[PDB]
C-alpha cells in the first residue's frame, strides 16, 4: 500500500495610494491629486495519490 498527498496554498496582497495637494495663494488656487491601487493574488493546489 502506498499513499501520496500534497496540498499547497499561496496568498498575496498589495495596496498603495498617493495623495498630493498643491495650492498657490497670493489669487488663491487649489489642486487636488488622488491615487489608489490594490492587488490581491491567491493560489491553491492539491494533489493526492493512493
Amino acid at each position: 500500500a502506498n499513499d501520496l498527498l500534497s496540498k499547497v496554498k499561496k496568498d498575496k496582497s498589495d495596496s498603495f495610494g498617493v495623495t498630493i495637494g498643491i495650492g498657490p495663494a497670493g489669487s488663491p488656487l487649489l489642486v487636488g491629486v488622488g491615487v489608489s491601487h490594490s492587488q490581491d493574488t491567491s493560489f491553491l493546489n492539491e494533489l493526492n495519490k493512493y
Binding site: 500500500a1 499513499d3 500534497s6 499547497v8 498575496k12 498603495f16 495610494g17
Partner: protein
Amino acid sequence: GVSVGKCRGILNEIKDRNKRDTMVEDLVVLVRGGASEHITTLAYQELPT
C-alpha cells in the same frame, strides 16, 4: 505629500505520509506410512493436530 505602501505575502506548505506492511505465512506437512482410511483422514491439508 508623498506616500506609498508595499506589502508582499507568500505561503507554502506540503505534508506527505506513506505506510506499507506485509506478512506471509506458510505451512507444509509430510506424511509417509498408512493406506487405510486413517491416513486418508490424516492427509487432510486443512490445523496441524
